[PDB]
Paper text:
The replicative hexameric DnaB helicase is composed of two domains that are connected by one flexible linker. The larger CTD exhibits a classical RecA fold, binds the nucleoside triphosphate and translocates the protein on the DNA, whereas the NTD surrounds the single-stranded DNA (ssDNA) during DNA unwinding and binds the primase1920. The DnaI helicase loader belongs to the AAA+ family of ATPases2526. Here we report a crystal structure of BstDnaB helicase in complex with BsuDnaI loader protein and the HBD of BstDnaG primase at 7.5 Å resolution.
The overall architecture of the 570-kDa complex exhibits a three-layered ring structure along the c axis of the crystal. The NTDs of BstDnaB together with the HBDs of BstDnaG form the first ring that lies on the top of the second ring, which consists of the CTDs of BstDnaB. The NTDs of BstDnaB pack into a more rigid triangular collar shape that exhibits a threefold symmetry, whereas the CTDs have a relatively loose collar shape with a pseudo sixfold symmetry. The BsuDnaI on the bottom forms the loosest triangular collar of trimer of dimers with an obvious threefold symmetry as well. The diameter of the central channel is around 50–55 Å throughout its length, which is wide enough to allow either double-stranded DNA or ssDNA to pass through the channel. The CTDs of hexameric BstDnaB helicase interact with both the NTDs and the CTDs of the helicase loader BsuDnaI with a total contact surface area of ~1,745 Å2 per hexamer. Therefore, it appears that the NTDs of BsuDnaI have the major role in recruiting the helicase loader into the prepriming complex. The CTDs of one dimer (chains N and O) exhibit a different orientation from the others and do not directly interact with the CTDs of the helicase. Moreover, the structure and the proposed model suggest that the release of helicase loaders may result from the binding of ssDNA to the helicase ring, which is accompanied by the shift from the ‘open-ring’ to the ‘open-spiral’, and then the ‘closed-spiral’ state of the helicase ring.
Numbering used by the authors:
A (entry chain F): 183 to 326, 338 to 363, 374 to 397, 413 to 441
B (entry chain N): 32 to 70, 82 to 98, 111 to 207, 211 to 234, 238 to 278, 284 to 309
C (entry chain M): 32 to 70, 82 to 101, 112 to 235, 237 to 276, 281 to 304
């Protein structure tokens, strides 16, 4: 928080951000997960201060991803909220799911197998269409032919005057996003998911940190 | 919500924290197919140390008996004669509980102990049709024919998942072949006392005898196998004339 | 059962984390005897800071014997008081007599390993070697292990208890206790590194019996360049003791 917030408070007394203009890539593992990380980098940042956001969910329809953060803001995902009529009970903690995620400003996404000149013409009228605090783009291994995308993703944080995010689906270290990309000369802060191995910057702080998980509500935990 | 149900289901076995540690397991457990395709295995929870793992009339129908002859399992109660303390000191623990059987509150089974031939298994196969008036997946088994093919190997990772925490287990006979049975039934009888469950017994010998016969060496692993079988109930006599 | 009720009663306040952290404790809690054969204590859960512990609530050699950090109400067990229907208690019977014999002043021999569950009493079994090495003019001392970290981090104003261990290291049959989930990590290269050298500067036999196993006691103290510093000073503990097997 310098800044329009990063992710965690021990991760906002670590590196410090998000600040003015940064290309980011959180090279996220298969098998383990990358779902709730989005439900804990851009879930509460829209629903508190008027530096609003947007969500790129490319390959899947944006609407299947809306069973992920409402079932993680209203803590209701075990009766269940992904298939129809609940038992006369789980209509309990609904007042926390959408009761904050509509008084902010977000554009969720699933527009075609995109190149990147979209978010250049789109972000010339979405900087002027939204409110802007972060710009959450899909993982760096689909948009096309993979390496070129990251190179022109550095400048994107420098146009709308807000830091821009684009994860990845390749241990995990900086030489596996390499067996499918370029990145190093471009993105100058590479976090991860096993463990958010933020092992890159000039600001100072870089550390070894994983967090606990619940997966009945998809919740992150810091201490 | 599923977690709540499971938690209280096995709260006798689980250490609150153990539940949250094995959360991934228990959640993956419920999320996957609770059934199989041979009807070849089904998932069941097991407590391993500090972690919980996942191992694989119109009254006799959906039942699933193991290693038994096909049509011998038909027995009633009017037809069962009522004689000595073989049948006049037993219908006092049987009938106090009929239409009143819970899970989430341990029930009393029985241990039919005595002779060689009188009536070992006619008070575990008759009541299996009181567990057919309501219809449970009530198990009926020969334990002489159980420590043989499961010594074998092929398939062996999970062979006793229907001989642990089924709603009913009418165990019949153990009279053949520090034993090959202390990480086997001695931990099978562990899940019959912390996931809220009762069991049913009948055999050839008796409690005194079986303790003096199990597991021998040059180790009280012979006198721990049988109070895992003298806990939920108190054993009573069987007496009368021979039946052959 | 009460714990279950309370847990769900205040599960909105308690949460799950602490539960998953203290999982081992809560699981060990339910797994052990909730009652006692005196009906002498029973286990109950207690919240200590951020961790949940398990406390028990109640259901020729005396001026020679002066054991530090422990009482004299703990040293009163023999071996003819010890039963044998279990597969643990006789191991000790055969062990120590063969060490009444291979040592005729200076021996540099072996040791014993009682490690595992919580019920045997590994200080009453040790309060027996301590019991009858004092009919003689000699000893087999018993001092607790966490007490070398209970009154030994506040008082490092030089000496203090760098100078009362000086003579507790001139008794042959000295026995070491609860190393494992009882003792944080400043001590091992200043005390329990310098514990097993000056006795072995002339070579002798020392003892180790706690609760956490051999291929595990090397690991319980990195609280790699951390596991290896837990593989040198301890290469004089597994180099000086032979295991007993809780079957």
């Amino acid at each position: 928080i310098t800044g329009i917030p990063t992710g965690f408070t021990e991760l906002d007394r670590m590196t410090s951000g998000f600040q003015r203009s940064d290309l980011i890539i959180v090279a996220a593992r298969p098998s383990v997960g990358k779902t709730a990380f989005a439900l804990n980098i851009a879930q509460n940042v829209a629903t508190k201060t008027n530096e609003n956001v947007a969500i790129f969910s490319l390959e899947m329809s944006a609407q299947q991803l809306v069973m992920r953060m409402l079932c993680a803001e209203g803590n209701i995902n075990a009766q269940n909220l992904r298939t129809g009529k609940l038992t006369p009970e789980d209509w309990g903690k609904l007042t926390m799911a959408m009761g904050s995620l509509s008084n902010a400003g977000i554009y969720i996404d699933d527009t075609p197998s995109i190149r990147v000149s979209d978010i250049r013409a789109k972000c010339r009228r979405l900087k002027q269409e939204s409110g802007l605090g972060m710009i959450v783009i899909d993982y760096l291994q689909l948009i096309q032919e993979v390496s070129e995308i990251s190179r022109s993703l550095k400048a994107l944080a420098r146009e709308l005057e807000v830091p821009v995010i684009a994860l990845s689906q390749l241990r995990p270290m900086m030489s596996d996003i390499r067996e499918s990309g370029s990145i190093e000369q471009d993105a100058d802060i590479v976090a991860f998911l096993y463990e958010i191995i933020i092992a890159k910057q000039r600001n100072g702080p870089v550390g070894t940190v994983q967090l606990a998980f619940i997966k009945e509500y998809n919740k992150f935990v810091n201490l | 919500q599923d977690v709540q149900a499971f938690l209280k289901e096995n709260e006798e076995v689980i250490d609150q924290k153990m539940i949250e540690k094995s959360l991934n397991k228990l959640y993956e457990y419920i999320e996957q197919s609770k059934n199989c395709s041979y009807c070849g295995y089904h998932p069941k929870l097991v407590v391993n140390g500090r972690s919980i793992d996942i191992e694989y009339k119109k009254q006799q129908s959906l039942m699933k008996s193991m290693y038994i002859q096909q049509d011998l399992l038909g027995a009633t109660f009017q037809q069962v004669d009522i004689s000595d303390p073989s049948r006049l000191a037993m219908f006092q623990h049987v009938t106090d509980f009929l239409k009143s059987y819970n899970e989430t509150g341990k029930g009393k089974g029985l241990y039919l102990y005595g002779k060689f031939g009188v009536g070992k298994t006619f008070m575990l196969a008759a009541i299996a049709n009181e567990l057919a008036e309501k219809e449970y997946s009530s198990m009926i088994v020969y334990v002489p024919e159980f420590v043989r093919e499961l010594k074998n190997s092929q398939t062996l990772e999970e062979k006793l998942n229907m001989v642990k925490t089924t709603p009913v287990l009418m165990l019949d006979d153990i009279g053949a072949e520090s034993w090959v049975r202390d990480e086997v039934i001695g931990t099978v009888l562990q899940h019959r006392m912390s996931q809220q469950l009762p069991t049913f017994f009948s055999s050839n010998f008796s409690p005194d005898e079986l303790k003096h016969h199990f597991t021998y060496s040059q180790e009280v692993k012979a006198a721990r196998l049988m109070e895992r079988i003298l806990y939920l109930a108190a054993p009573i006599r069987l007496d009368g004339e021979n039946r052959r």
